[PDB]
């Protein structure tokens, strides 16, 4: 449960100076199309030794390396993968849970939780598109639970990395001065609504319940005043949530 | 360009989503907001006095915080009070010693509101009123650990441990909250066009504009933004600006008192403005610098215009014209271009048309018997006898005048609302609260929860009563009394529970009227001029009876003139109706 800064540093430098042989990113249009085709062919699942698994493992390794609130590795990790490609791949109509998890983790550990301020994050619509996709995934989970049939992988994605990224974005010192919050009130409101519905389900575990409660509390705290008001129908349960949190 | 020093008074301009200066609402309200529509850097707002802040160094509040916590053991309490007093004295000594030291990036500084004399602080145990996710910032008279605010560069050119230069954007981070101040776009419902300021992560930057320098802030030298009185030696009279017959006019008011120095009125207060290259820079006036005169109440500036003497002195609404410009020729020798010392004889000269100010005995209000307003024209030549002496003014007078002006503004708004035939419940509550504060101010008694309707004042404050009379606050009270009836409210219907808050409002108004005429002949006569309307409300539970009785019994002449068979008959009828000993 500890991070070795030196190991992360050497891994990052070795990966960068090794070349395209070790690190492969489908950032090109043709490469993006090939990734889309292989992902569509992998609708049933991801093979153990398929190139998609290798790409997911590489993205996870880069995200883990960038972890630890450092500056040496995080800048290089962000440079390797820009936000535009993450939005293009994650926001595509057709996608898979593993790739979404990997990219969301990469964004959380290399963009949201950066040790050094970066202007390109909190002054763009990339993360707001990401948040609308998060709301869509939450709605998908709710609809699936409506029919009593749901995919565990999607639930895990919505519960583990989605909530962590939402909390990090709305709990970082550098995000307190977001300039596009006022123009993007609806989306955040939607997020809150989605979270509320996710908390309304009974199957949520105690640890998951606590994590969702913390995320809702952070969203409400950031949503106190932004030239916005809580809808009364939505506020009906937010009042109970606040009462429970105060207790 | 110059470096920033401790004690300098500078203006903060918000940069980001909303651009504007930091201002404070009216009354004793501690809320801080930003009004982009009020003005900008090119065109500062008219009420610029509310956008001035003074920089102060670190202040220790450990003993004060401990004493406050303990209060919220008599010997222990006394020891804590003594420790707090010693800490305050030590902090004052440190501020005096460290005065004038350069400000370095990354240091801790505090902002003090000169107009309100309250330190800005960020409360870490409560959220903002509007933006719940944000954090509240408020002005505190004594301050606390929240006053501490680290200053950091906004650009990459500067770094920690570097001098701060004027006209540069900086970030203020509270020591406790640790969140840059943000000018939230959330508009204030109470006041349209006002944006609340809170503490939350953002990219807003506060530009620093220098207005008054620690070296030039010496009280011994006249400085821009300071209010004084101009006195004429030969005439032994004071210059003033007043609305004679609906139009503002400037005149040398005559006094029948045996002591000219005691003939001081709030409306006769004048402020000195210095002209500099930067419109927001006042500095300290030099003997070779242009000067302007401003009215502390009406806001108009002194000027000279073609006299229907060739030019007569009048008041203009804006100082954006060379007419308002004036120069002070010293009567005696001066130390080259040294700063003008306070309370020094000077001669006013109008440089716009190259004419010299003078005084004449021709009244401006000849229409009224025994005129008091006197004309002040200009002469092409210079006269040594036309010398005006400067007199200092205590801060208490400025605070009282500002409070009176704000209260008069809200009372005029309330009168307008009442005349419209519809007043909101929130507006009625605000009016009632304002009348409550006015009652407390007239009574000069601390607000300790005692029934203000029965408030008791041992010694009336003559200055406060004169301020109320001259500022037309009593006229506003009379208008409030007369507006609902003129309808909105009826005297016979006051018994109904619906108009109970209106009844309490009339109650507070009558208390105000009674408390402003305690052993003061001028106020007594001013109120008695409305004897007819006061008697029109006789009998009803409004306590017009007690006010009328006190006012008329205090003065023999008023009782002789006003009381007649009709008043006695009304009193007999009402006592028969009620049969009460009162
Ligand atoms: O001593 P008394 O009998 O009250 O008379 C005072 C004085 O003689 C004037 O009537 C008046 O001054 P001005 O003529 O200059 O107005 C002043 O009121 P003021 O305080 O409003 O000036 C009075 O208080």
UniProtKB/Swiss-Prot annotation, chain A:
Effect seen on changing residue 114 to M: In CMT1J; uncertain significance
Domain of life: Eukaryota
Tissue localization of expression: Expressed in intestinal crypt and villus epithelial cells.
Clinical condition linked: Charcot-Marie-Tooth disease, demyelinating, type 1J: An autosomal dominant demyelinating form of Charcot-Marie-Tooth disease, a disorder of the peripheral nervous system, characterized by progressive weakness and atrophy, initially of the peroneal muscles and later of the distal muscles of the arms. Charcot-Marie-Tooth disease is classified in two main groups on the basis of electrophysiologic properties and histopathology: primary peripheral demyelinating neuropathies (designated CMT1 when they are dominantly inherited) and primary peripheral axonal neuropathies (CMT2).
Domain notes: Composed of a large N-terminal cytoplasmic domain (CD) followed by a juxtamembrane domain (JD) and a transmembrane domain (TMD).
Function: Inositol 1,4,5-trisphosphate-gated calcium channel that, upon 1D-myo-inositol 1,4,5-trisphosphate binding, transports calcium from the endoplasmic reticulum lumen to cytoplasm, thus releasing the intracellular calcium and therefore participates in cellular calcium ion homeostasis.
Quaternary structure and interacting proteins, as annotated: Homotetramer. Homodimer. Interacts with TRPC1, TRPC3 and TRPC4. Interacts with TRPV4. Interacts with SIGMAR1. Interacts with PML and AKT1. Interacts with IRAG2 (via coiled-coil domain). Interacts with CABP1. Interacts with TMBIM4/LFG4. Interacts with CEMIP. Interacts with TESPA1. Interacts with TMEM203. Interacts with BOK; regulates ITPR3 expression. Interacts with BCL2L10. Interacts with CHGA and CHGB.
Name of this chain's protein: Inositol 1,4,5-trisphosphate-gated calcium channel ITPR3
Organism for this UniProt entry: Homo sapiens
């Amino acid at each position: 449960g500890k991070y070795v800064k030196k190991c992360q540093d050497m891994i990052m430098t070795e990966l960068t100076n090794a070349g395209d042989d070790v690190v492969v990113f489908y950032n090109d249009k043709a490469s993006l199309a090939h990734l889309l085709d292989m992902m569509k062919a992998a609708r049933d699942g991801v093979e153990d030794h398929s190139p998609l698994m290798y790409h997911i493992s590489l993205v996870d390794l880069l995200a883990a390396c960038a972890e630890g609130k450092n500056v040496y590795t995080e800048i290089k990790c962000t440079s390797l993968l820009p936000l535009e490609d993450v939005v293009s791949v994650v926001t595509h109509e057709d996608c898979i849970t593993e790739v979404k998890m990997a990219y969301v983790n990469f964004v959380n550990h290399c963009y949201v939780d950066t040790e050094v301020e970066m202007k390109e994050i909190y002054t763009s619509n990339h993360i707001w598109t990401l948040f609308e996709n998060f709301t869509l995934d939450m709605a998908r989970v709710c609809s699936k639970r409506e029919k009593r049939v749901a995919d565990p992988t999607l639930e895990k994605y919505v519960l583990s990395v989605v909530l962590d990224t939402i909390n990090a974005f709305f709990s970082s010192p550098f995000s307190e001065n977001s300039t596009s919050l006022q123009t993007h009130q609806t989306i955040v409101v939607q997020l809150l609504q989605s979270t509320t519905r996710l908390l309304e389900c009974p199957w949520l575990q105690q640890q998951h319940k606590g994590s969702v409660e913390a995320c809702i509390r952070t969203l409400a705290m950031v949503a106190k005043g932004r030239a916005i008001l809580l809808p009364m129908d939505l506020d009906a349960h937010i009042s109970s949530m606040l009462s429970s949190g105060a207790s | 360009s110059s470096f920033l020093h401790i004690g300098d008074i500078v203006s903060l301009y918000a940069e980001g989503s909303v651009n504007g200066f930091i201002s404070t609402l009216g009354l004793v309200d501690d809320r801080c907001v930003v009004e982009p529509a009020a003005g900008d850097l090119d065109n500062p707002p008219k009420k610029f006095r509310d956008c001035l802040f003074k920089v102060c160094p670190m202040n220790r509040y450990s003993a004060q915080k401990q004493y406050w916590k303990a209060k919220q053991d008599v010997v222990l309490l006394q020891k804590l009070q003594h420790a707090a007093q010693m800490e305050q004295k030590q902090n004052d000594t440190e501020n005096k010693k460290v005065h004038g030291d350069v400000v370095k990036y990354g240091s801790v500084i505090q902002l003090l509101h000169m107009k309100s004399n309250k330190y800005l602080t960020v409360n870490k145990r409560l959220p903002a009123l509007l933006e719940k996710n944000a954090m509240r910032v408020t002005l505190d008279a004594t301050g606390n650990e929240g006053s501490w605010l680290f200053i950091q560069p906004f650009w990459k050119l500067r770094s920690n441990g570097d001098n701060v230069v004027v006209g540069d954007k900086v970030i203020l981070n509270p020591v406790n909250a640790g969140q840059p101040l943000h000018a939230s776009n959330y508009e204030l419902s109470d006041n349209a066009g006002c944006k609340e300021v809170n503490s939350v992560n953002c990219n807003t930057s506060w530009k620093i504009n220098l207005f008054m320098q620690f070296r030039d802030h010496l009280e011994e030298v006249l400085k821009g933004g300071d209010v004084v009185r101009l006195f004429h030696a030969e005439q032994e009279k004071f210059l003033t600006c007043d609305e004679y017959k609906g139009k503002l006019q400037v005149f040398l008011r005559t006094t029948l008192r045996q002591s000219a120095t005691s003939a001081t009125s709030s409306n006769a207060l004048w402020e000195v403005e210095v002209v500099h290259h930067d419109p927001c820079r006042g500095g300290a006036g030099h003997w070779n610098g242009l000067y302007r005169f401003k009215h502390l109440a009406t806001g108009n500036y002194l000027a000279a215009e073609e006299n229907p003497i060739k030019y007569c002195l009048v008041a203009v609404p804006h100082g954006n014209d060379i007419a308002s410009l004036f120069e002070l020729d010293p009567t005696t020798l001066q130390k080259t271009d040294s700063f003008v010392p306070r309370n020094s004889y000077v001669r006013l000269r109008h440089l716009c048309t190259n004419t010299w100010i003078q005084s004449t005995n021709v009244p401006i209000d000849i229409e009224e018997e025994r005129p008091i307003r006197l004309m002040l024209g200009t002469c092409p030549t210079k006269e040594d006898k036309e010398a005006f002496a400067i007199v200092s003014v205590p801060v208490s007078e400025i605070r009282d005048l500002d409070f009176a002006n704000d209260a008069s503004s809200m009372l005029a708004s309330a009168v307008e609302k009442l005349n419209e035939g519809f007043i909101s419940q929130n507006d009625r509550r605000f009016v009632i609260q304002l009348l409550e504060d006015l009652v407390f101010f007239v009574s000069d008694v601390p607000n300790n929860g005692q029934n203000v309707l029965d408030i008791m004042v041992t010694k009336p404050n003559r200055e406060r009563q004169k301020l109320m009379r001259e500022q037309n606050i009593l006229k506003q009270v009379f208008g409030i009394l007369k507006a609902p009836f003129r309808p909105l409210v009826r005297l016979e219907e006051l018994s109904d529970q619906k108009n109970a808050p209106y009844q309490h409002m009339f109650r507070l108004c009558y208390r105000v009227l009674r408390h402003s005429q305690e052993d003061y002949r001028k106020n007594q006569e001013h109120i008695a001029k409305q004897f007819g309307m006061m008697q029109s409300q006789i009998g009803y539970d409004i306590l017009a009876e007690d006010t009328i009785t006190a006012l008329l019994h205090n003065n023999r002449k008023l009782l002789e003139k006003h009381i007649t068979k009709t008043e006695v008959e009304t009193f007999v009828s009402l006592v028969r109706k009620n049969r009460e000993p009162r």
